[PDB]
Amino acid sequence: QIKKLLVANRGEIAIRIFRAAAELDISTVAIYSNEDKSSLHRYKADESYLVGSDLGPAESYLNIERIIDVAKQANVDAIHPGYGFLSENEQFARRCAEEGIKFIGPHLEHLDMFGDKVKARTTAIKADLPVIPIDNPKHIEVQVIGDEHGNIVHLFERDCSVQRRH
Amino acid sequence: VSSSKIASFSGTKQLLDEVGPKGVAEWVKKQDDVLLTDTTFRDAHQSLLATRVRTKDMINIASKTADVFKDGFSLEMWGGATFDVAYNFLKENPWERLERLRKAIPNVLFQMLLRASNAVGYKNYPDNVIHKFVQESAKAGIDVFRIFDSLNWVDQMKVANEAVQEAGKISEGTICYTGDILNPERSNIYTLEYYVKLAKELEREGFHILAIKDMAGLLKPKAAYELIGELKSAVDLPIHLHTHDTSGNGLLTYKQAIDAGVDIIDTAVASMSGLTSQPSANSLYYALNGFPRHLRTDIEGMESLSHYWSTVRTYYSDFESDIKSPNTEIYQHEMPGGQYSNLSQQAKSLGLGERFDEVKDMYRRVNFLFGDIVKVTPSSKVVGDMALYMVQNDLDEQSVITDGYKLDFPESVVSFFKGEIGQPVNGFNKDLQAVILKGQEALTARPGEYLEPVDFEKVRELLEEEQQGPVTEQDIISYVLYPKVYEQYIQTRNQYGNLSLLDTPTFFFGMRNGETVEIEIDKGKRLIIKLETISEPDENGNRTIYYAMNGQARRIYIKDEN
Amino acid sequence: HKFVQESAKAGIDVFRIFDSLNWVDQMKVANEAVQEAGKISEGTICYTGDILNPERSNIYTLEYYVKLAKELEREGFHILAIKDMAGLLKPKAAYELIGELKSAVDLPIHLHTHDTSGNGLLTYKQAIDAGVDIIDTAVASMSGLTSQPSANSLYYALNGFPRHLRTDIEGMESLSHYWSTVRTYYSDFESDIKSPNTEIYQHEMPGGQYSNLSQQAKSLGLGERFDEVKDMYRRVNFLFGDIVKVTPSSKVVGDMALYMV
Amino acid sequence: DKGKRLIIKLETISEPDENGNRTIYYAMNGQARRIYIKDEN
Amino acid sequence: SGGAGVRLDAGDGFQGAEISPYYDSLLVKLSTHAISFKQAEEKMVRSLREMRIRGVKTNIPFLINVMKNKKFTSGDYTTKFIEETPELFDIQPSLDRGTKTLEYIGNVTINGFPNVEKRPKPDYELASIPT
């Protein structure tokens, strides 16, 4: 039931989501930093706002408080964080629901369940999967899409074994 | 200031909603403080910047003005030269100015200056044009109509008054000041009893507020005392003083009218005030320290508004006047407002620049020749045009009769003697008049009487056929007022769109290489334009502009004009 | 001494003597020089603060000026001068201050103000009701803003009031017109100010100073925070114990304000 | 070479910049193509 | 790129963006798709070889160089791949005629030729060439 959507992000994932949103007939907001005044992603939404003159290049996309005004200002009612600033962040999520704004990610308990290291380890053992100590390793990952109704499929795997250190 | 905060203010606007026009006036009368009407949006720049200031520059501080003037009586923000100019030079719609400001400043009354005969027009209109204009202006947000007449002829003021009363809005009936009541030898006619008898008249005509319009800044400090003291016991109407600071005596006049009990005064922001503008509100506020009545305003906000207009005024420097000092010669010639400059930029275009002296001198004499008249637009244009002509043809109080049969007087004079601007207070010298009309008949009644009502039907079907289709009430009334100028606005708008959205340095100067410019369209959605380069001219003389609009590379073709 | 003598000889008849801190002991030396030269010695008080407003100073009160005027009468000045170097003298204040001193001291009172707030003329109006003997003006085309109030203007302003300006206006309009043209030769030197300015009452910078002090604030890197410099100029006044500001004391406060931002 | 060839339109050259570099706008085999030329004196 | 099996998700690249040192530089996301894995690879390499990005260095060649590799086509590869395949880094820049020729023309157009006076450019007889 979402009339408009703000992306707490930039670049490809922003554009990507803007497009998804356009497809569902949804009005979209973009945020930018002073360094992104002319980044592609500013242009590809219906609405564009400065996160604030006084906020540096790194800070712009990481200020929980400041992003959320832009939101409330634009009569927005959902935020998609994309990946890689506040997408994993426990506080940002909490804040969103509080302001009435819908966080497009898993539930509040999931983020710190999985976000810490030491805690992920506990969770898995509670559903027993493997762990302990790695020759000719292969990096394999499984996409899962679950709803808010305990219907949770998986979209098979990928093979991210082609890497340099990080 | 935030719109939420503005949505919560109650000022003279919502007063009008609750108590109606007669209730507003009543409430003016009970205020101890002098109330102020700010004139930054009309008369300040009409006087200092040839009416050039653009909606965009006003929209920008509107929310700060709503906060700053919250306790004001009104914002004078429409009428005068602003309708024509906006359409004509700024090529923007003065109705969009009215309505965009209305939304941003919901709390304070809106004032416009409304000329009796023709509203805001330039010729004479039938009565149903006046009514249409006032209907639509009221609908669009105008609350206080300062109805004035070029010649203080009350008969000519009635039609507008009716309109405003019907619209349920506030009519201020205006008296224009000339002569000098301090000086028995200035005039028999323009004496203190003359203002009293005319106040008493506008009051019997149902005007809610009485305005003294001192358009040539002629009302001397003591005279302001005397005049307002007499009017206040002569009538029940709140009195609303308007003057210009061209003599440098604006503040003192305002002080004296305050001691004498005036209700509302017109000031401007400091940076936009003084000489031919109104006296400064920032100064008066301090000038009254330790006297009996206080100016009702926020000076901290005013100092802040002044700083804004300091910078914006800079955008308009090609439109500043020569005038850089007060002038006390006005007491002799009585040249209203800008005229003194509007009329030298003209005496030069006729190889008279070298003897504007003798022109100043003829203006005065001409005034007594035309039998001592009130000199606002457009009567000041009559007197001016006659002075030019008379200097240029080496003419005389006596030569104008003797040699008048072969003379060929400027249109605007024939038209004054023909009655087309109304009836002067002292009639026409019949012989002066014969020699200028050369036979044609003068009007008896007020001009509008003689006019076929306009048929807005025919106008609508003419606009709809010209434009795509759907056309509004404002469009229709605009065209009736300014046919040529309205059509030129549509053509411009087809070619180029809504230009009132560009900022002023872009609207006048374009852009420079490397420049990036943002045009605000909606909230959060702006046109990002950046200029990569300008080419050399092709064969048919077209230079190619290389933009990057909204990131996207883009290419435009302009004919170089040389 | 050598300067006053030569000056006298060469045609100067009236010496207006002022100190930038209103320190009487520093004026005695020029005064003795003027007395010895048989010429007129004008004893200047500089106006600061704001005698209408008790919050402004426990020091610059009506009583401080009265006291300071009598002290000048004792050193044997022939005229009393009030230099309102920043135009801080509000209208009601001038009325009250000229009142007191006209009953405090038997000296003619000579009033000098600048029109920077826009109220100059109003001030002269008020001082004139209060009994004042001489005022400083300028011709219209040489007046206004940071200059003197207009003589031409004051002339017509006082029509119908009891006293009047003793001058020839028709001659003044002529003076005005001549200077209006001459001013033109000098345009490369024209103030940047073009408006009256009532922040004058908060920061108290004299004369032209607040545009020099603004040049300077830019020629450094503080043009954007000029609001902070105006504020510091003010605060730096109290830091220094609340002082009269005319050359060179006003430079001191400006210099300090620049330094501290 | 045999039936491979470069089609170049020079559309415009720009006024220089502080660093002292002109921008040449071309079209090349169907492509917008921008180039930086240093300007010696 | 475009065409069969190619998907492109815009990042920072276009027209004339400046890319800054402030964020992860990602110009385009390029994905390809076919029924065979080899076929998707030879699709990737087509597409990579089509791209032109100019004014910045890119990682295209390295990427070409992983695609072409038998040991990635084999499918049997471990996260130890890149580290135990040193020759992924063997990168020749080819003689990008086009670019170079624009540099030369630009240079002469602006700074003229050594011994040669700046006149209006010849090829000024429409008498072409006997053959």
Ligand SMILES: O=CCCCC[C@@H]1SC[C@@H]2NC(=O)N[C@@H]21
């Ligand atoms: O400074 C002049 C522009 C550079 C032209 C370069 C050409 S390449 C062949 C010939 N050899 C040179 O040293 N310069 C010209």
Ligand SMILES: [Mn+2]
């Ligand atoms: Mn006016």
Ligand SMILES: [Mn+2]
């Ligand atoms: Mn001085």
